[PDB]
């Protein structure tokens, strides 16, 4: 009867088609073509060095036992109820740089299945996976991270299974936009890694690598320019006469207090890393600059016991060195 005899004579206990036995058993390997689609991307929580992707994975391969004779002569493709994706052979795939993953089952198991006449099978499964990409935060606001995703096999060695990408358009995505970063859909380098685990053998692994560039907008708006204006205020205090010299001290204190609070905030907001970051570099720089303004006030105080001359040399040296530092710092961490 219509199409159920098809599905059954093709794959079920009624027909001799074993889901547990790969195709071409004891022959060539299985070439599992692949191509991804990324629907959502984000939740980059540097506190854990991870990112979350909600994607429509897709993979096709060959299985001569699933050939459609003239019994179906209406189209070159065929779509079945996803509930039978668990009845035919599947490639044992997983993600190695993975922390926690899950399917998406809402109103059905979000699975897609296509079968052609040549045996070419295709299967897709929506997935929301929380991968990990170790961050190199030496250049914090200008970090050019390379966050990766290496699809591996498991259970099947390279002598039976073998992954390969799709020639054209392997990783799609539509109107992407993030709050912090700015993906380079062109700088999407991908390639082979081909893990080798001792005791078992060679396992195949193909990896995508997205180049994530961080926007310096938020930091340039929230910390850098504020601290710059603070250190600029610090210089205005020099103009005040040393006779009164009762508010220059709290002015230098503002140059230390505010900066320490900013450092503490931005530190407790970011992960814990030994290697120093450009952010902390600039922070301690402005910190020591305010500190130097204050200790120069202290000196002129002890110099008062010709002090104005010291203030002159200060107005001459402070901005020059600060601006040389800013120049070299931007030229280094641009």
């Amino acid at each position: 009867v219509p199409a159920n005899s098809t599905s059954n004579i093709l794959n079920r206990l009624l027909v001799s088609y074993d889901p547990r036995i790969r195709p071409n058993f004891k022959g060539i390997p299985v070439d599992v073509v692949v191509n991804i689609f990324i629907n959502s991307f984000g939740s980059i929580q540097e506190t854990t060095m991870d990112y979350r992707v909600n994607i429509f994975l897709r993979q096709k391969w060959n299985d001569p036992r699933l050939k459609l004779p003239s019994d179906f002569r209406g189209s070159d493709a065929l779509t079945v109820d996803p509930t039978m994706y668990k009845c035919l052979w599947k490639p044992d795939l997983f993600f190695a740089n993975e922390k926690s993953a899950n399917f998406h089952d809402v109103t059905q198991e979000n699975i897609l299945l296509f079968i052609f006449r040549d045996g070419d099978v295709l299967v897709s499964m929506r997935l929301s996976i929380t991968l990990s990409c170790p961050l190199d935060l030496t250049l914090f606001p200008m970090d050019t991270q390379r966050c990766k995703m290496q699809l591996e096999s498991f259970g099947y060695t390279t002598d039976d299974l073998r992954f390969i990408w799709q020639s054209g358009d392997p990783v799609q995505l539509e109107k992407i936009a993030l709050p912090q970063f700015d993906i380079k859909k062109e700088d999407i380098e991908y390639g082979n890694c081909t893990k080798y685990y001792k005791g078992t053998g060679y396992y195949t692994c193909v990896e995508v690598i997205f180049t994530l560039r961080r926007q310096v907008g938020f930091y340039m708006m929230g910390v850098y320019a504020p601290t710059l204006l603070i250190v600029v205020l610090s210089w205005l205090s020099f103009w005040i006469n040393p006779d009164a010299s009762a508010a220059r001290v709290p002015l230098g204190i503002f140059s230390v207090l505010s900066l320490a609070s900013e450092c503490t905030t931005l530190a407790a907001e970011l992960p814990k890393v030994s290697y120093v970051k450009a952010l902390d570099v600039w922070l301690i720089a402005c910190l020591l600059f305010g500190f130097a303004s204050l200790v120069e006030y202290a000196v002129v105080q002890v110099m008062l016991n010709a002090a104005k001359r010291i203030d002159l040399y200060a107005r001459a040296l402070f901005p020059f060195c600060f601006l040389f530092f800013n120049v070299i710092y931007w030229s280094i961490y641009l």
Binding site: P2, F37, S237
Partner: protein, 338 residues
Amino acid sequence: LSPSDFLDKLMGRTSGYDARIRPNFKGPPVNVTCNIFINSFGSVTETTMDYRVNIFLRQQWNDSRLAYSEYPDDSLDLDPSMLDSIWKPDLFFANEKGANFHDVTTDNKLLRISKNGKVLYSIRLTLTLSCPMDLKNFPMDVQTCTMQLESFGYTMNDLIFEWLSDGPVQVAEGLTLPQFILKEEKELGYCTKHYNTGKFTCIEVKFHLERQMGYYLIQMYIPSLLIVILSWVSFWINMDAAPARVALGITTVLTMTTQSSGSRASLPKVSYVKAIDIWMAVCLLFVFAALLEYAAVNFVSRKFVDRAKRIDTISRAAFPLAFLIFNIFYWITYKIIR
């Protein structure tokens, strides 16, 4: 006859039913009518750019096999446990991050069947959807939170979603939001996803969220404005009463920078500018300029006292005016838009 033998003869192992296919296989597609009833609405957080909803989704469609003639009734109610034995159209929300059914005393579902085969399948679902939020004008924004419906294993040639003509989307009476104002202008549309595998059908509904600014008013704007209006008093004071003016300016700057740091770090991380940040920066700068003005007065008054008093009165009569004009432009450019 008997309900047991009835539901066996119908969509049961005794019947010729095959739930692994769609109606009229190798024929025209289905015209599925969808409609959702909302119950709750919250968790709207700019940090994750998400929003939570618990909805009683409903799909009506046609399945010619289920048409029966044993009972005089036109519409019939069945047991959810039979749902798993009939066809169901694959459906997902392409803009979801976490979604779940609800299992309490049962699998919460509903399955009505009309004599003409018209099936009605309703399912309760809790959804943490995603919404790309544009915060160009944060405290007073008009967001465009979306909800998409679309198949995943059935293409347009076989499945076609469609909204319901009348009352496709409802909202439960008495529903209120913490700091948002849901609008009754829920605009529908088709997204018609086009992938490298087929032409998937689609539906989308766009809500319009009108944020409330009472919290930001009584927590940021009013304190900043009061701090600035306080700092202004320093100008009216004589240049001799230094401690008064210096204390006013210094405490004003300190509290203003505290408010700035707080209300700036309590927000998500975005490159583009924000109205609240503009306002915080401008008030910080007003009080900063008051302090720098006292400094310039001290410098001038090493006659000089005349210039000092002249600048004092100029500031006292201008800075309020500067804040007035800036506030006018600010409100009249960030409110007229909505």
